[PDB]
Design an enzyme around this catalytic site. Structure first.
Site, short mmCIF file in Angstrom:
data_model
loop_
_atom_site.label_atom_id
_atom_site.label_comp_id
_atom_site.label_asym_id
_atom_site.label_seq_id
_atom_site.Cartn_x
_atom_site.Cartn_y
_atom_site.Cartn_z
N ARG A 184 -2.57 23.48 -22.35
CA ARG A 184 -3.05 24.41 -21.34
C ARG A 184 -3.55 23.67 -20.12
O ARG A 184 -4.46 22.84 -20.23
CB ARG A 184 -4.19 25.20 -21.93
CG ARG A 184 -4.26 26.61 -21.46
CD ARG A 184 -4.99 27.43 -22.50
NE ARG A 184 -4.29 28.67 -22.75
CZ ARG A 184 -4.15 29.63 -21.84
NH1 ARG A 184 -4.67 29.48 -20.63
NH2 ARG A 184 -3.49 30.75 -22.15
N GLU B 46 -5.74 23.97 -17.43
CA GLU B 46 -6.84 24.62 -16.76
C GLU B 46 -7.34 23.69 -15.66
O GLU B 46 -7.58 22.50 -15.89
CB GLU B 46 -7.96 24.98 -17.73
CG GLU B 46 -8.36 23.86 -18.66
CD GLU B 46 -8.19 24.22 -20.12
OE1 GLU B 46 -8.68 23.46 -20.97
OE2 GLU B 46 -7.57 25.27 -20.42
N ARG C 236 -16.28 23.20 -23.25
CA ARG C 236 -15.73 24.03 -24.31
C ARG C 236 -14.21 23.97 -24.47
O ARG C 236 -13.67 24.60 -25.38
CB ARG C 236 -16.17 25.48 -24.15
CG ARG C 236 -17.65 25.70 -24.44
CD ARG C 236 -18.07 27.07 -23.93
NE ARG C 236 -17.57 27.27 -22.58
CZ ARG C 236 -18.11 26.73 -21.49
NH1 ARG C 236 -19.19 25.95 -21.57
NH2 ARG C 236 -17.52 26.90 -20.31
N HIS C 237 -13.52 23.27 -23.57
CA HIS C 237 -12.07 23.13 -23.69
C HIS C 237 -11.42 21.94 -22.99
O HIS C 237 -11.97 21.36 -22.05
CB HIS C 237 -11.31 24.42 -23.36
CG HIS C 237 -12.00 25.30 -22.38
ND1 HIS C 237 -12.72 26.41 -22.76
CD2 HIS C 237 -12.10 25.23 -21.03
CE1 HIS C 237 -13.24 26.99 -21.70
NE2 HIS C 237 -12.88 26.30 -20.63
N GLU D 211 -16.58 31.37 -28.39
CA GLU D 211 -15.40 31.90 -29.06
C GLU D 211 -14.58 30.76 -29.67
O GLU D 211 -14.20 29.82 -28.96
CB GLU D 211 -14.54 32.66 -28.07
CG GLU D 211 -13.16 32.97 -28.59
CD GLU D 211 -12.22 33.36 -27.49
OE1 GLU D 211 -12.54 33.12 -26.30
OE2 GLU D 211 -11.14 33.92 -27.81
N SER E 296 -9.21 33.99 -31.83
CA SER E 296 -8.87 35.34 -31.42
C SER E 296 -7.57 35.78 -32.09
O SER E 296 -6.70 34.96 -32.39
CB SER E 296 -8.73 35.45 -29.90
OG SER E 296 -7.51 34.90 -29.43
N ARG F 27 -12.87 23.44 -31.20
CA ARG F 27 -13.92 24.42 -30.95
C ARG F 27 -14.64 24.81 -32.23
O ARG F 27 -15.85 25.01 -32.22
CB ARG F 27 -13.34 25.66 -30.26
CG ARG F 27 -13.88 25.88 -28.85
CD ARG F 27 -12.84 26.55 -27.96
NE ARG F 27 -12.20 27.69 -28.63
CZ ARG F 27 -10.89 27.75 -28.89
NH1 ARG F 27 -10.10 26.75 -28.55
NH2 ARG F 27 -10.39 28.82 -29.50
#
Lengths: 438, 438
Positions: B214, B216, B222-223, B361, B364, B412
């Site tokens: 990903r 970002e 957190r990522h 989180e 999901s 996570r």
């Protein structure tokens, strides 16, 4: 859940009990006074029998309406009888159609009509509906599990290295270039340097099973552009034989796990998988070259044994030793990577080895050069710049123990294990020079 | 092998016996009448005592020449005694220096001089020599093992799907665009489409633990741009509750495994990992929205619960429910993907959920839309072209059972489990918006 049991989870103990099964409509037989509905599971078929007088009228007329490949769910009473080919049958109380299927189907799940490999890969969801295809992936899953089990039992810790790299490699191409924002990166084709670096941290015995990427310009029945490698590295060894012995037992463990658990799958494939015979014979590169030459395959001393050679040696080994698995070792130093340790006494040969399963290489490895200066010189010998490998060489400067390891091709392992013709048979979504979808 | 026993595997049962230890020179006490050598293992420290009157002279002379971080192997006799702070000691018979270390060291293995996270990341091999760092990594491997065991115990088959995709599944950017020869592709962020296709194959219960990518644009704790995801999909479910319940038990199993087997690691981290109390509480999006209302955080219905909202919610749940883990479900359909099933009864709400661990989180999922026509409609509703999803949609046309699954962030899950301030602590070579090397 729409089901309580799989076709295989129903046994004597349940006789006379209500159960719930679900799957795809395999076959329907309206024989007038009695109807039959066979449902397909990932484990097999379940017979649902409906004697006009014992089943609900609405249910009696529903059965002939069901079509091939419809997803249905049946609730009924288990009935063990010698009349049922599989030992028992289900007397339906309720039948629900969860999803109707279109027609024609992309593939014949019945198997009558064969379909090209391409068609099957395009419709993998259909292809796996055939027992012999499902069997392969059940076996693939088992192999991974066994491999991981063996590592754990031997004190190996699972590590995870980066897939996006910008660091140097002895190779150069077959690397998928990529863009990391402003920077330029590539997909890693091996954790080699990272796993070695971790040998200076004290983890000692590490392993990783992850995907590697190679942009080979040509398709072959042996490799793909995306694969799952089983890498391992172990410190405090004395010679490559320690690594060979370990690999050997790892492979034997995975093979025997498949023989025990996937006996059903092996039967379906009409394949008899041999009991591993340890230890596998070791065939030095020079012995291999002598053997090959006598077969008319002349490999000049120094260059590596090709595809035809591996094929010949595999056969030779099979007829002369009944050895489906054997090691090729003590390769010429010029034929191996800069990080393979040489025999200090015979510097022209190195401590590298390759594991051949049915005449195809499934793994290679060996004892690494942990001595910084010697390593630096071997990089220079390969005509490479040691400065391009600083991030790596730095790890060899602050207490680097002796170490060695291997790289095991997962697909190649499974393909050779089951003696499959094409490698696209052991991976769900193959990535070819010509295949990018699905 | 240069060692037979790790510091941790030497017990009463071996007293008086010859053993072989190996590690990095930790400390030397050059005393003239006796010499003391401490060696560091991946598991701890070992004391080697060499009294002048009891050891080989050459050995006596050697020890004081040893320096910090040198790799040494020692053969000796186990001696249990109260005089040893660690219970026993080794009476050296042979000492070998496998490799010497350079000074100064990139980092301080003693933990005296703290180093900034970037320095530690640049020198991971040095960093793992500190017990608190090695502990995280041992726990990470245990989590992976625990997760796989649970999956297998529950009838899941491990599958492996493509990392190189052309397939723009639910999108925008945050994708790493690639070049697959003539074609341009992307690095997958999820096995989503592929794991759903396999649901029509009959595999029924699948899982995959693999790298996801990903892009970002912004750094956070957190990522990362590269992660390991634990994906799963199961068929014949009746609602997203069946999936939530499975995820719940999987996470609990992983947490309890770390509690049993890494008790020692947790002590080093001076952390008390709580016992999972199932079932975790499920807070509907509407209720969460109301709870935040009391707390003064106004989030317009339809919008996403941001970072502060998540934080306030997890704090509320911890203090008022003793729940460090809880679900958030029945989200606004508008806020979720085209493959999620909506409540046929309340279309504005969908069968999606999120797992929150200590207010962050970690996963999901939800029940998907297995109905082809409705699904195509939902693809349209999202501004996407159904025809770009041909290979995917095709699987929903010939018998697609109801199904649902989830994506569980590995880093996570571990970061939140150990209440670590930064996600970079739980992955060896982090890929940032600014980190590409090593």
């Amino acid at each position: 859940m729409y089901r309580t049991h799989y076709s295989s989870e129903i046994t004597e103990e349940l006789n006379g009990q209500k159960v719930k099964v679900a799957g795809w409509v395999w076959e329907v037989k309206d024989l007038g006074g009695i109807k039959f509905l066979w449902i397909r599971d990932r484990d097999g078929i379940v017979q649902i029998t409906a004697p006009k007088k014992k089943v609900d009228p609405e249910l009696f007329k529903l059965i002939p309406k069901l079509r091939s490949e419809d997803v249905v769910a049946v609730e009924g009473v288990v009935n063990f009888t010698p009349k049922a080919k599989l030992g028992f049958e289900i007397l339906p109380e309720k039948i629900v159609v969860l999803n109707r299927a279109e027609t024609p189907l992309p593939l014949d799940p019945t198997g009558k009509v064969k379909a090209e490999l391409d068609t099957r890969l395009d419709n993998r969801f259909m292809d796996l509906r055939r027992p012999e295809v499902m069997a392969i992936f059940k076996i693939r899953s088992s192999v991974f599990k066994a491999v991981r089990d063996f590592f754990h039992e031997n004190g190996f810790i699972e590590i995870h290295t980066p897939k996006i790299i910008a660091t140097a490699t002895e190779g150069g191409t077959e690397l998928f270039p990529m863009k990391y924002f402003e920077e330029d990166a590539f997909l890693a084709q091996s954790p080699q340097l990272y796993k070695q670096i971790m040998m200076a941290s004290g983890l000692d015995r590490v392993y990783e099973i992850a995907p590697i990427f190679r942009a080979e310009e040509h398709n072959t029945t042996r490799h793909l552009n995306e694969a799952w490698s089983i890498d391992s590295e172990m410190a405090f060894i004395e010679d490559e034989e320690e690594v060979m012995s370990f690999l050997e037992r790892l492979v034997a463990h995975a093979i025997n796990y498949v023989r025990e658990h996937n006996a059903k799958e092996l039967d379906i494939l009409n394949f008899e998988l041999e009991e591993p015979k340890l230890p596998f014979p070791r065939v030095s590169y020079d012995k291999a070259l002598e053997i090959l030459g006598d077969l008319g395959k002349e490999i000049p001393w120094g260059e590596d044994i090709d595809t035809e050679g591996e094929r010949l040696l595999g056969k030779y080994m099979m007829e002369n030793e009944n050895a489906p698995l054997y090691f090729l070792y003590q390769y010429p130093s010029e034929a191996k990577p800069f990080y393979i340790m040489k025999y200090d006494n015979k510097p022209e040969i190195c401590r590298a080895f390759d594991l051949e399963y049915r005449g195809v290489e499934i793994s290679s490895g060996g004892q690494r050069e942990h001595r910084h200066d010697i390593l630096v010189e071997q990089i220079k010998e390969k005509g490479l710049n040691p400065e391009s490998f600083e991030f790596y060489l730095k790890a060899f400067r602050y207490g680097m123990p002796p170490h060695g390891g291997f790289g095991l091709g997962a697909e190649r392992l499974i393909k050779q294990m089951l003696d499959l013709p094409n490698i696209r048979e052991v991976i769900l979504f193959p990535r070819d020079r010509r295949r990018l979808t699905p």
